Design a protein around this ligand. Sequence first.
Ligand SMILES: NC(=O)c1ccc[n+]([C@@H]2O[C@H](COP(=O)([O-])OP(=O)(O)OC[C@H]3O[C@@H](n4cnc5c(N)ncnc54)[C@H](OP(=O)(O)O)[C@@H]3O)[C@@H](O)[C@H]2O)c1
Ligand SMILES: O=CN(O)CCCP(=O)(O)O
Ligand SMILES: [Cl-]
Ligand SMILES: [Mg+2]
Ligand SMILES: [Mg+2]
Ligand SMILES: [Mg+2]
Length: 410
Amino acid sequence: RVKRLVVLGSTGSIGKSTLEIAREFPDIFQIVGLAAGGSNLALLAEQVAAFRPQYVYLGDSSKVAELQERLNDHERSAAFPRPRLLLGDEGLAELACVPNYDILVSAIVGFKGVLPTLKALEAGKDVALANKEALVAAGPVFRCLLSTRGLLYGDQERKCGLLLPVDSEHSAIFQALQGVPASCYPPRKLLLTASGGPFRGRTRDELEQVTLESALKHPKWSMGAKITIDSATLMNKGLEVIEAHFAFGCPYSSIEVLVHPQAVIHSAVELRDGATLAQLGLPDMKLPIAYALTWPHRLAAPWSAGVDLTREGNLTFEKPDLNTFGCLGLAYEAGERGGVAPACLNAANEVAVERFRNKEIGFVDIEDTVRHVMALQERERDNFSDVSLQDVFDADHWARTAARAFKPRK
Ligand SMILES: NC(=O)c1ccc[n+]([C@@H]2O[C@H](COP(=O)([O-])OP(=O)(O)OC[C@H]3O[C@@H](n4cnc5c(N)ncnc54)[C@H](OP(=O)(O)O)[C@@H]3O)[C@@H](O)[C@H]2O)c1
Ligand SMILES: O=CN(O)CCCP(=O)(O)O
Ligand SMILES: [Cl-]
Ligand SMILES: [Mg+2]
Ligand SMILES: [Mg+2]
Ligand SMILES: [Mg+2]
């Protein structure tokens, strides 16, 4: 009855919110595993000491000695059973395959979450999937593995484990879809709401003078760096459009993106009769994270506040400006092309976001980086057809090298 969790990326935004839930409901949740990359070992050490995982994976093996030290400090305050450390590229896979856990919280960023996510599902474990990049890149493989071309989340296949959404928009849609019978599925239209990010209503030339600083101040949501930057480019919504296609089995024509700055409506579905079902809330990821862990039950928490529309003011809905923010067009083009185009788009974007965060390239060059890569992938072969997992790996790599080699125009 307890749910044993393995949290990947425990030190990030999603990971910490997950453990906040585990801490408030210790009778329900037990932590068997934590994984982190090593950039914040002080927090990993305090997480290990608090939750006493049996297994810990460390993405950077160079910092085993520092982790051991910080654990040794915590042991002097209070003794706890030392975990077995897992390392290397095979470490994440072994952790995901441990028996003795029910749910894998996949909150690693990027393509490095794909495989652990895959082997947990195959190992019969449910996956609360935050890592959108997995489904963007390896959508077909998830669809084949879960043996569905429709709704991948849930068990509405009415052995593999269940896949449940953590992202705010996919959670809203998934909650709104609860109770929609098969006769009304797929929905007519999927409405994904985007805050529009901090540069809403700015010209493309106003975006030349934009600092990393300004890009990292998000109006409605407090999150990681990559996702916050992607909301400023609107490549975050672009990625969610492709994720939705594979997750809900909807054509790209059925998928609409509305700029809703107040971020009150988290996303919606339109049904055959013209009824729209929308899920509303405050911008806190503990609701969706918790729903992925409790589905179909909903936990009542001290932070479980709820939105007051009278107080909130007024709700605005607008079309995105596809000229200024070309990343959204790039996602739609990539999705319609199919094959490994989604993968190349994601990798090119990951690289451009990192280069933008290391001050090597500027903001406007993120879109031009992604455009450059995909122009070339079009010129190279287009056989697509079947999408092998290794085919995704090869394109991801190729795209990363091309994204790094891109030199901004002079
Ligand atoms: N509000 C949200 O944040 C939100 C909402 C919806 C979806 N998502 C999606 O979920 C993913 C996580 O986003 P986030 O904001 O939580 O990212 P983040 O805050 O930057 O967290 C990154 C996590 O991944 C760990 N990590 C990095 N490299 C690793 C590696 N090689 N091996 C093991 N762990 C590694 C990191 O450890 P260290 O930092 O210690 O190195 C850290 O714990 C993203 O795809 C995001 O698009 C996020
Ligand atoms: O998990 C929450 N999001 O992905 C949405 C916040 C980013 P947006 O500006 O694209 O709505
Ligand atoms: Cl289905
Ligand atoms: Mg996280
Ligand atoms: Mg434990
Ligand atoms: Mg096609």
